Tab-separated table of N, CA and C and ligand atoms in Angstrom:
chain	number	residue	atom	x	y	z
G	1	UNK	N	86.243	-4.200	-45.674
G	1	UNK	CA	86.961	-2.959	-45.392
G	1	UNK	C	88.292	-3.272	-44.713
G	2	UNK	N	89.063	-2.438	-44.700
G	2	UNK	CA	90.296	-2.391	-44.003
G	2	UNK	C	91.657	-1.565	-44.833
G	3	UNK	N	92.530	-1.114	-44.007
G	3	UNK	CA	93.209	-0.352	-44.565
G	3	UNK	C	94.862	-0.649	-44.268
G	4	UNK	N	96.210	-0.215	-44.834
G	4	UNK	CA	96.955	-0.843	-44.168
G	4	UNK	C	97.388	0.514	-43.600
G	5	UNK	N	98.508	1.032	-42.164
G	5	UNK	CA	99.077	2.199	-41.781
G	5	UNK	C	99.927	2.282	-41.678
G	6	UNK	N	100.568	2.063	-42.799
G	6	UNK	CA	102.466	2.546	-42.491
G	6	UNK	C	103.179	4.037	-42.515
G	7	UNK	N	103.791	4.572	-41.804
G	7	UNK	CA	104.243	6.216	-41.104
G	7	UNK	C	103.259	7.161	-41.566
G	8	UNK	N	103.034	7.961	-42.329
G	8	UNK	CA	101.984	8.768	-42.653
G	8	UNK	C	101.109	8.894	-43.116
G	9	UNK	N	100.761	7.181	-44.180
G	9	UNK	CA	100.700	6.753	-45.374
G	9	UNK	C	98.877	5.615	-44.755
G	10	UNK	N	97.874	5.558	-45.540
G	10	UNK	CA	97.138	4.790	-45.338
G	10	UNK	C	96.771	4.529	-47.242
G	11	UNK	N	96.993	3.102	-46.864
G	11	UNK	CA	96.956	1.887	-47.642
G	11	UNK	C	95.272	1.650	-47.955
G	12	UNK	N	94.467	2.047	-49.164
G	12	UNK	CA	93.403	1.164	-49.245
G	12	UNK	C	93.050	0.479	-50.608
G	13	UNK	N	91.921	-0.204	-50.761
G	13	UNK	CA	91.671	-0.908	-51.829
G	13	UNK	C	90.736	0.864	-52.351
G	14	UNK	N	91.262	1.140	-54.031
G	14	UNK	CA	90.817	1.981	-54.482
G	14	UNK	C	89.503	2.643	-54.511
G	15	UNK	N	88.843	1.472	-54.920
G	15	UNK	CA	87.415	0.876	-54.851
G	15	UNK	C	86.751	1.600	-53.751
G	16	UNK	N	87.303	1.339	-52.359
G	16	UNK	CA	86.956	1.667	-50.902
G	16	UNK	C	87.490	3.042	-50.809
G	17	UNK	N	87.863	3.360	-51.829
G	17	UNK	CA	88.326	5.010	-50.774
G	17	UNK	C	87.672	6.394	-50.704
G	18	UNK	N	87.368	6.574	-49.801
G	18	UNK	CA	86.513	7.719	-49.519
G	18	UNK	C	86.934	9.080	-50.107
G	19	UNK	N	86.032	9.924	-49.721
G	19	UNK	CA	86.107	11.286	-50.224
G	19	UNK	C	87.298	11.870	-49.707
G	20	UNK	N	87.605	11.397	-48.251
G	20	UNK	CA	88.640	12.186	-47.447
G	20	UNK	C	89.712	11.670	-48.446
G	21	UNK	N	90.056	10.501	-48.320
G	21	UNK	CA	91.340	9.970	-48.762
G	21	UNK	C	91.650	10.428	-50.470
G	22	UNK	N	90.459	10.329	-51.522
G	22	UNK	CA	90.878	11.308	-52.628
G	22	UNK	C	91.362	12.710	-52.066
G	23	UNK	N	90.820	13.452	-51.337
G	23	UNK	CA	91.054	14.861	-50.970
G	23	UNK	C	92.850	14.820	-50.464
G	24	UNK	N	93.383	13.741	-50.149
G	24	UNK	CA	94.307	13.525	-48.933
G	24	UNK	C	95.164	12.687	-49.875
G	25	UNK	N	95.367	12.687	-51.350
G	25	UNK	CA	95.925	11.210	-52.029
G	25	UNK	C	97.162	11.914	-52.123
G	26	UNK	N	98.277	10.526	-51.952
G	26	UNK	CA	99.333	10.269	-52.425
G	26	UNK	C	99.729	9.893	-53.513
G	27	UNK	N	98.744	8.638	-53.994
G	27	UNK	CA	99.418	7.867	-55.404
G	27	UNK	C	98.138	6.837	-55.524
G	28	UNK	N	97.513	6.439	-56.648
G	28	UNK	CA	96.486	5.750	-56.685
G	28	UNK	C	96.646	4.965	-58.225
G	29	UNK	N	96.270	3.592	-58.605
G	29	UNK	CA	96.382	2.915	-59.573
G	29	UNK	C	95.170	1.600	-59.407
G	30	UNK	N	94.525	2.482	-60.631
G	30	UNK	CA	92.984	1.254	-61.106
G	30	UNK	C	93.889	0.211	-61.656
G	31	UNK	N	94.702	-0.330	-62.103
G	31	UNK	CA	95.254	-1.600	-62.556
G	31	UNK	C	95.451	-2.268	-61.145
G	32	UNK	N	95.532	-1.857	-60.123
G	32	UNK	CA	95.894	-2.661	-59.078
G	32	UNK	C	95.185	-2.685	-58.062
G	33	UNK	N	94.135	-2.059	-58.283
G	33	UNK	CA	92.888	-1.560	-57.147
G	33	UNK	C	94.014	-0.544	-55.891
G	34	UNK	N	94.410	0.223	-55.946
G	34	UNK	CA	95.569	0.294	-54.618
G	34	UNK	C	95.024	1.995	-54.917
G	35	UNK	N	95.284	2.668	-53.619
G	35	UNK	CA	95.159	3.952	-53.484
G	35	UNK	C	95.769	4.438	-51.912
G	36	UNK	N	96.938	5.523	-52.018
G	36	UNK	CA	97.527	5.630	-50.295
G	36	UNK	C	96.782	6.864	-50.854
G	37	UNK	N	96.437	7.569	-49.168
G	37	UNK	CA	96.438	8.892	-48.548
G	37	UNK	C	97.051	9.136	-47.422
G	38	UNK	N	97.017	10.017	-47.497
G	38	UNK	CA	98.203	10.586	-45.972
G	38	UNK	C	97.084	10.774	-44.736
G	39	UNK	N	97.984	10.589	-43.410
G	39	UNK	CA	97.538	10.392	-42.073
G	39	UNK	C	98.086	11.459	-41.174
G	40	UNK	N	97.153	12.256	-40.433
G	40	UNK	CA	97.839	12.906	-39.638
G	40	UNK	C	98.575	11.997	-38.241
G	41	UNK	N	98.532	11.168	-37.726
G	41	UNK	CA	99.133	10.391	-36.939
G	41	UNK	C	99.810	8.833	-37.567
G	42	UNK	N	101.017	9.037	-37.038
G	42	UNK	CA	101.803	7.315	-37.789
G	42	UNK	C	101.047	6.200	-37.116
G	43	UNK	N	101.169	5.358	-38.432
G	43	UNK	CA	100.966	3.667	-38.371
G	43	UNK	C	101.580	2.927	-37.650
G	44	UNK	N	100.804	1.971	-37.814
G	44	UNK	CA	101.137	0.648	-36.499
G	44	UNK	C	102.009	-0.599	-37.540
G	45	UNK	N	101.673	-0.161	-38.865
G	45	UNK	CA	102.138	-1.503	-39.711
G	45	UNK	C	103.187	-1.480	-40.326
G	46	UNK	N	104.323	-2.313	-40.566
G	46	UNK	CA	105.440	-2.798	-40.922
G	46	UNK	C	105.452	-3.212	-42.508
G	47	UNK	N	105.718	-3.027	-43.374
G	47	UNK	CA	105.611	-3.689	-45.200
G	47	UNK	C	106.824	-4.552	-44.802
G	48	UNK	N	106.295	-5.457	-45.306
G	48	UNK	CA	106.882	-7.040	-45.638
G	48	UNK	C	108.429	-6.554	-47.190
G	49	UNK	N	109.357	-6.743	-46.875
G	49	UNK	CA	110.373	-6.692	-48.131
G	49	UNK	C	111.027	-7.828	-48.414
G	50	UNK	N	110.329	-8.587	-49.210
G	50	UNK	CA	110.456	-10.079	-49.527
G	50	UNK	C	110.007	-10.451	-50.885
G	51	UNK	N	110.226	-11.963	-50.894
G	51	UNK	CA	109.545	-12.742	-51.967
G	51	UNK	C	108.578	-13.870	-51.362
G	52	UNK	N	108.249	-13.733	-49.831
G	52	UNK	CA	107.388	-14.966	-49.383
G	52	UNK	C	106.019	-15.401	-50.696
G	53	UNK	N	106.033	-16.457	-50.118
G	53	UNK	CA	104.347	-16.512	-51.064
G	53	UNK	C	103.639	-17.738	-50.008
G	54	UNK	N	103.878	-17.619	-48.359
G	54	UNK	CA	103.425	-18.382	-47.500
G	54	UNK	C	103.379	-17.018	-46.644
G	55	UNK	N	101.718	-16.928	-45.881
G	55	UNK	CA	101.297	-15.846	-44.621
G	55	UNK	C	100.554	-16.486	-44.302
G	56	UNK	N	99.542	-14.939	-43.428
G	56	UNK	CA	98.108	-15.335	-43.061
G	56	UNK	C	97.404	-13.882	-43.523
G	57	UNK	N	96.289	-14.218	-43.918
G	57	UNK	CA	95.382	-13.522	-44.079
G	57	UNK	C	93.929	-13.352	-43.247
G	58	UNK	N	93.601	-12.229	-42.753
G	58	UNK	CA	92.176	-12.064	-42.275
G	58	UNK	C	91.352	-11.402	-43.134
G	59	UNK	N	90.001	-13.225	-43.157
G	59	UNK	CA	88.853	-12.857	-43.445
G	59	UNK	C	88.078	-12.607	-42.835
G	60	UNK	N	87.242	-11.219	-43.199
G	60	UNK	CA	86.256	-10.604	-42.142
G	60	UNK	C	84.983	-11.322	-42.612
G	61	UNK	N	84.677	-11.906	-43.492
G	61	UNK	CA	83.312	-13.261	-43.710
G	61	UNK	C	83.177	-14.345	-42.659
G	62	UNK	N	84.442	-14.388	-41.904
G	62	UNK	CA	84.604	-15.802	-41.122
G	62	UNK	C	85.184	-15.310	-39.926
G	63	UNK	N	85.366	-13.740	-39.808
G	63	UNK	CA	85.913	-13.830	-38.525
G	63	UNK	C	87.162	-14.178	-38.008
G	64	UNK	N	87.693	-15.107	-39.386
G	64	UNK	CA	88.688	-15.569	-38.975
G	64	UNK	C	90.378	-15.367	-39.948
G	65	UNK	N	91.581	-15.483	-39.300
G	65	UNK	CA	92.998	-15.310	-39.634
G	65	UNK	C	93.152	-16.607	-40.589
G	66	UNK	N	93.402	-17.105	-41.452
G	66	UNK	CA	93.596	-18.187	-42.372
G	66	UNK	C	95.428	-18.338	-43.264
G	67	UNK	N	95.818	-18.891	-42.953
G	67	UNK	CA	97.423	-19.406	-43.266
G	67	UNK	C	96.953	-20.517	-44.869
G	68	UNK	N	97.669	-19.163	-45.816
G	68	UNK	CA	97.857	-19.295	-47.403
G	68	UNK	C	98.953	-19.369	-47.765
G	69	UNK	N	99.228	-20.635	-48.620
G	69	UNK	CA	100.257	-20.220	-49.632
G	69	UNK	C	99.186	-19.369	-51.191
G	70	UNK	N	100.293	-18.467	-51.618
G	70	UNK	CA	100.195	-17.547	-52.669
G	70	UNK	C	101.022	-17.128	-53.673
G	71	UNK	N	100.489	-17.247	-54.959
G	71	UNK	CA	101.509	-16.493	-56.038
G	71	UNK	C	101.915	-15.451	-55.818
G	72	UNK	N	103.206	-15.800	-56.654
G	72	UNK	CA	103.883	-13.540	-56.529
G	72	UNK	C	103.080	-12.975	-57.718
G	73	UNK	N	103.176	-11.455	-57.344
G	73	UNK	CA	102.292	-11.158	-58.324
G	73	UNK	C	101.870	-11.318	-59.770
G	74	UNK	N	101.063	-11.318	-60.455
G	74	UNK	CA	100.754	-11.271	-61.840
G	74	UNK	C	99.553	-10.264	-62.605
G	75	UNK	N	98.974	-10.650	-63.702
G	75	UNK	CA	97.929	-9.775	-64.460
G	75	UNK	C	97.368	-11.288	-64.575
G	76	UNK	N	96.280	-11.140	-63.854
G	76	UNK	CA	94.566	-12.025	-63.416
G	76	UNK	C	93.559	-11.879	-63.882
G	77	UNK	N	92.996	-12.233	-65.014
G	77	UNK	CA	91.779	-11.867	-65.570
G	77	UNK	C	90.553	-12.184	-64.353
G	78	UNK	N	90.588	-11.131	-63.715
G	78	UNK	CA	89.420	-11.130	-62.225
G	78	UNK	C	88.063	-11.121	-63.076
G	79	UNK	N	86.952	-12.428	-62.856
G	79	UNK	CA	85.631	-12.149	-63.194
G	79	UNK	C	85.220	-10.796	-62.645
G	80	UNK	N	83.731	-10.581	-62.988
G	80	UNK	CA	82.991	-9.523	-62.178
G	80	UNK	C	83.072	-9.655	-60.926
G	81	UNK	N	82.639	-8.813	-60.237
G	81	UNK	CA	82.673	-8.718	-58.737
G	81	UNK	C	81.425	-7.301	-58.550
G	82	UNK	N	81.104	-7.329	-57.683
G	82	UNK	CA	79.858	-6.016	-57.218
G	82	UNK	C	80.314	-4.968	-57.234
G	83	UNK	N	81.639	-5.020	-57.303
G	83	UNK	CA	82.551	-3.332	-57.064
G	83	UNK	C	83.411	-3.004	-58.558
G	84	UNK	N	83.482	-4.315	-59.694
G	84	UNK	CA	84.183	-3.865	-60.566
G	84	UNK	C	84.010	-5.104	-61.616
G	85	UNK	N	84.553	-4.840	-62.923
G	85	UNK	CA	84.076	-5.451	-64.174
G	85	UNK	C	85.010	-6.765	-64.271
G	86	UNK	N	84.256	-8.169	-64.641
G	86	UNK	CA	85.539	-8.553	-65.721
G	86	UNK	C	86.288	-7.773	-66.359
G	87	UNK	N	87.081	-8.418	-65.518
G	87	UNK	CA	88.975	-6.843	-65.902
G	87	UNK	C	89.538	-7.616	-65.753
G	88	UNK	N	90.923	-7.111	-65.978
G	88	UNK	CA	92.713	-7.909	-65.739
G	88	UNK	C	92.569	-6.938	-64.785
G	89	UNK	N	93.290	-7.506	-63.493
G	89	UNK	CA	94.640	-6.800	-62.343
G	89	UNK	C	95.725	-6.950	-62.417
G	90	UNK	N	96.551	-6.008	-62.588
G	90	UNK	CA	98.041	-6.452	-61.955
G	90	UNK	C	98.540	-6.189	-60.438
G	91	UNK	N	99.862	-6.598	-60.418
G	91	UNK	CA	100.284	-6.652	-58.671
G	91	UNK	C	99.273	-7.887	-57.953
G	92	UNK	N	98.695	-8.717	-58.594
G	92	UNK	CA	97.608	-9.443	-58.141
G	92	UNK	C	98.339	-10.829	-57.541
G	93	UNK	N	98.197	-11.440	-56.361
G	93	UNK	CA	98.467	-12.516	-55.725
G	93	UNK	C	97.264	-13.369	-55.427
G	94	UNK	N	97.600	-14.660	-56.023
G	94	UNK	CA	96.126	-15.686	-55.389
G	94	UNK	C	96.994	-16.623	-54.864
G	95	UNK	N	95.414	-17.030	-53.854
G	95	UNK	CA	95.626	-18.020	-52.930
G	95	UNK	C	94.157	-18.663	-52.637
G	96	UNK	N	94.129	-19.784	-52.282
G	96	UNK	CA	92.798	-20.627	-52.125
G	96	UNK	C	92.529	-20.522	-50.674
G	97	UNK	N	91.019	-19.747	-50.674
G	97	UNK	CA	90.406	-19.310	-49.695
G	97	UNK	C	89.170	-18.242	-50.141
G	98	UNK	N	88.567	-17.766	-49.237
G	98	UNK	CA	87.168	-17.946	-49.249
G	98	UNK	C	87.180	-16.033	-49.134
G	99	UNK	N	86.867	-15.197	-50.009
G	99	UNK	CA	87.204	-13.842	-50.428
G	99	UNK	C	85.515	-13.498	-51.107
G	100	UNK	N	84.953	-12.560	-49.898
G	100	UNK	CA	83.359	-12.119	-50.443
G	100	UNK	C	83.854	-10.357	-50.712
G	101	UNK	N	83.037	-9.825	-51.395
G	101	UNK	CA	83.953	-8.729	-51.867
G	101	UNK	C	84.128	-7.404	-49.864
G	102	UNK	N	83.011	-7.829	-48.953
G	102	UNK	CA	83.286	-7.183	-48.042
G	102	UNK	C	84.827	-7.498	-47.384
G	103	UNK	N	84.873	-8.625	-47.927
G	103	UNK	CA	86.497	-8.800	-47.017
G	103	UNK	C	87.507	-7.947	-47.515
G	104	UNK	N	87.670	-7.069	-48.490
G	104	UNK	CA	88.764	-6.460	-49.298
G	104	UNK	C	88.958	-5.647	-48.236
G	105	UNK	N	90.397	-5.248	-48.026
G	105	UNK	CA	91.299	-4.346	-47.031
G	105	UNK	C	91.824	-5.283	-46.091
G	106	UNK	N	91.486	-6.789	-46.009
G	106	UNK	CA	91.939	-7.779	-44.764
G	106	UNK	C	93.297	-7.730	-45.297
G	107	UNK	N	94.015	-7.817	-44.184
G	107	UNK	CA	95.523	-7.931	-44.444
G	107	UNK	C	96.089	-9.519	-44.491
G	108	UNK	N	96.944	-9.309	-45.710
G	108	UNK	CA	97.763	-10.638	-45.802
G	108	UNK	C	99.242	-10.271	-45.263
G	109	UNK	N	99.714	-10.846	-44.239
G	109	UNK	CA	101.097	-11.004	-43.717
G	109	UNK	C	101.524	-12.194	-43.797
G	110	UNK	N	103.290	-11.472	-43.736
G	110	UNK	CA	103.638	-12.835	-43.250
G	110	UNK	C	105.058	-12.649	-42.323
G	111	UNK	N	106.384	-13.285	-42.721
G	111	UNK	CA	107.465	-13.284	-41.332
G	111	UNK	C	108.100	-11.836	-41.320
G	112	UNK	N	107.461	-11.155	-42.465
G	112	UNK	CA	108.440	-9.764	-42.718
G	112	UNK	C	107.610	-8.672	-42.427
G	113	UNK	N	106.398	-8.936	-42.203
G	113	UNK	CA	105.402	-8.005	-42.261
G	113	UNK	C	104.403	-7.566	-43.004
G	114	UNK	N	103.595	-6.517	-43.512
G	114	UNK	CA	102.223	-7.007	-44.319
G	114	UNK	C	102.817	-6.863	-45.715
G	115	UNK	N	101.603	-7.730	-46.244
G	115	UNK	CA	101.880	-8.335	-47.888
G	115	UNK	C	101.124	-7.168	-48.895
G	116	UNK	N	100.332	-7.069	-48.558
G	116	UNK	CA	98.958	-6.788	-49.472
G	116	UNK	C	97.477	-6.556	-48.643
G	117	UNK	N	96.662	-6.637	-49.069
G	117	UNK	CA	95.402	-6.627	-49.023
G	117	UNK	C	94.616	-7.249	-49.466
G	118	UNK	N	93.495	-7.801	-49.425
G	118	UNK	CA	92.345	-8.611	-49.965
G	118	UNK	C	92.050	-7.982	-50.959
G	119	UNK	N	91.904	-8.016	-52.140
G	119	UNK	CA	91.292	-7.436	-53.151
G	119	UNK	C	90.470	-8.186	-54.192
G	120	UNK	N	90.309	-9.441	-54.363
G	120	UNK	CA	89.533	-9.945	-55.307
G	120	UNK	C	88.922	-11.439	-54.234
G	121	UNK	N	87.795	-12.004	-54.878
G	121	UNK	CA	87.313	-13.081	-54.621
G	121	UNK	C	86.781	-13.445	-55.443
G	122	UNK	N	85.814	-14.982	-54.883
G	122	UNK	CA	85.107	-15.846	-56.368
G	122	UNK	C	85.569	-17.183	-55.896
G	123	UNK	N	84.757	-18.204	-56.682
G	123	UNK	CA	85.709	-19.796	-57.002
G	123	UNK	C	86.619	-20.228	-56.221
G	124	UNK	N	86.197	-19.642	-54.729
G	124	UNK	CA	87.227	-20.444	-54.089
G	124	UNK	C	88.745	-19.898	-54.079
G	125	UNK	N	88.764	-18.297	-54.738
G	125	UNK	CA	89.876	-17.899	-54.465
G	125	UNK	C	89.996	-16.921	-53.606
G	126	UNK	N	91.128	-16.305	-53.438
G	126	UNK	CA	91.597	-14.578	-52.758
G	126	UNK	C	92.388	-14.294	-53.120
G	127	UNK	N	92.037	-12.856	-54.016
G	127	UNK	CA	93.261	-12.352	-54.535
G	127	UNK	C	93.754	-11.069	-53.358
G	128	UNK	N	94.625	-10.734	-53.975
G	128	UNK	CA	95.625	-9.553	-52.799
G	128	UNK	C	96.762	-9.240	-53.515
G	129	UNK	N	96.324	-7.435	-53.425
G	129	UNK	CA	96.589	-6.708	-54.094
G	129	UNK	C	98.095	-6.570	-53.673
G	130	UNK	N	99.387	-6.891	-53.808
G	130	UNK	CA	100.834	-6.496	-53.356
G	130	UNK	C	101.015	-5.376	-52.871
G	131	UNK	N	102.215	-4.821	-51.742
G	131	UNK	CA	102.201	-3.608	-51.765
G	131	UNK	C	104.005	-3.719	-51.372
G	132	UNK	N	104.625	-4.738	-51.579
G	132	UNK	CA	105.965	-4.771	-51.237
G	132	UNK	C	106.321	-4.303	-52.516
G	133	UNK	N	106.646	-3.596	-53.277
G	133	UNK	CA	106.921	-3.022	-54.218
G	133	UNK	C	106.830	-1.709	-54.080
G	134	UNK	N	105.925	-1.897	-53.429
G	134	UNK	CA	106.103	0.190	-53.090
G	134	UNK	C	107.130	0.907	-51.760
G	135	UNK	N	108.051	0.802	-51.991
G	135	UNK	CA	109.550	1.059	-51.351
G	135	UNK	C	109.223	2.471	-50.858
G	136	UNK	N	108.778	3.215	-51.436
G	136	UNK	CA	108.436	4.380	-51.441
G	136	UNK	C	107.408	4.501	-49.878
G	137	UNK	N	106.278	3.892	-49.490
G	137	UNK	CA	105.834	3.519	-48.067
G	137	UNK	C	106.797	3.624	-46.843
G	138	UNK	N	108.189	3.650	-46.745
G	138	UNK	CA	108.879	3.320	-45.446
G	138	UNK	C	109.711	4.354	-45.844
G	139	UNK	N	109.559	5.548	-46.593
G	139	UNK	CA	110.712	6.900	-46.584
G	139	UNK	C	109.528	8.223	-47.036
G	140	UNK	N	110.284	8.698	-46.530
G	140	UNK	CA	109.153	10.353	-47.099
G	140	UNK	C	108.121	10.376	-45.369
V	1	RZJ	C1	106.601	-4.158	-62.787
V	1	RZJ	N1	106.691	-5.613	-62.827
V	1	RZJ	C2	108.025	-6.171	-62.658
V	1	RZJ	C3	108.297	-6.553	-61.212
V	1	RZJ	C4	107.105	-7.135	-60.442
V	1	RZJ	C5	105.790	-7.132	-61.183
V	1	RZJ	C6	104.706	-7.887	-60.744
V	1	RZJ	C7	103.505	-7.887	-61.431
V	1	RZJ	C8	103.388	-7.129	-62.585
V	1	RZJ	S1	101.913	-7.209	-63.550
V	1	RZJ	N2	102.151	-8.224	-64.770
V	1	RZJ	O1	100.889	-7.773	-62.720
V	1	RZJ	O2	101.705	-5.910	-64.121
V	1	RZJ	C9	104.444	-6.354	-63.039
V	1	RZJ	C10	105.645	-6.359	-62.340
V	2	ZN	ZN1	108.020	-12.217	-46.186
């Protein structure tokens, strides 16, 4: 679980989003697992406006913050997972590290601020879903 909070706006993995947050949606896309709803009180989090592909990410399997290098995004033929099919993602970033599907919503940052989200695992990878592309997060 986890969500990101930038000004009015809450950031989750689609998959994870509750009844409130459909009731409450902004903009939502199954190609990318990504879904915002609106917040009655502003966020604490900053969107990253970059091209890094070096952060850190927290995994909630380990408890622990982990420093990845990562691709910029692409379309990932993601095996199965408990929450969704052998599918393609797009907006998808990997990096080698250790991604059980409870970790999805851990935030990947880095010197600019947050990246993405945890959204895929498996084989020793972690994918994370982009969200520096959505320009649209830091106006309205
Ligand atoms: C829209 N467009 C161009 C700019 C960045 C970007 C990144 C990933 C993907 S993709 N192939 O995952 O849909 C598409 C895309
Ligand atoms: Zn950056």
């Amino acid at each position: 679980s986890g969500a990101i909070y930038v000004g009015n706006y809450r950031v989750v993995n689609r998959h994870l989003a509750t009844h409130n947050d459909w009731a409450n949606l902004v903009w939502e896309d199954s190609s990318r697992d990504l879904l915002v709803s609106s917040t009655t009180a502003q966020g604490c989090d900053t969107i990253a406006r970059c091209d890094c592909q070096t952060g850190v990410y927290y995994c909630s399997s380990r408890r622990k913050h982990y420093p990845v290098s990562f691709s910029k995004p692409s379309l990932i033929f993601v095996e199965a997972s408990e929450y969704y099919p052998a599918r393609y993602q797009s907006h998808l970033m990997l990096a080698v590290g250790h991604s059980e599907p409870g970790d999805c919503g851990g935030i990947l940052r880095c010197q600019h601020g947050v990246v993405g989200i945890v959204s895929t695992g498996g084989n020793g990878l972690v994918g994370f879903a982009d969200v520096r592309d959505l320009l649209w997060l830091d106006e309205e």
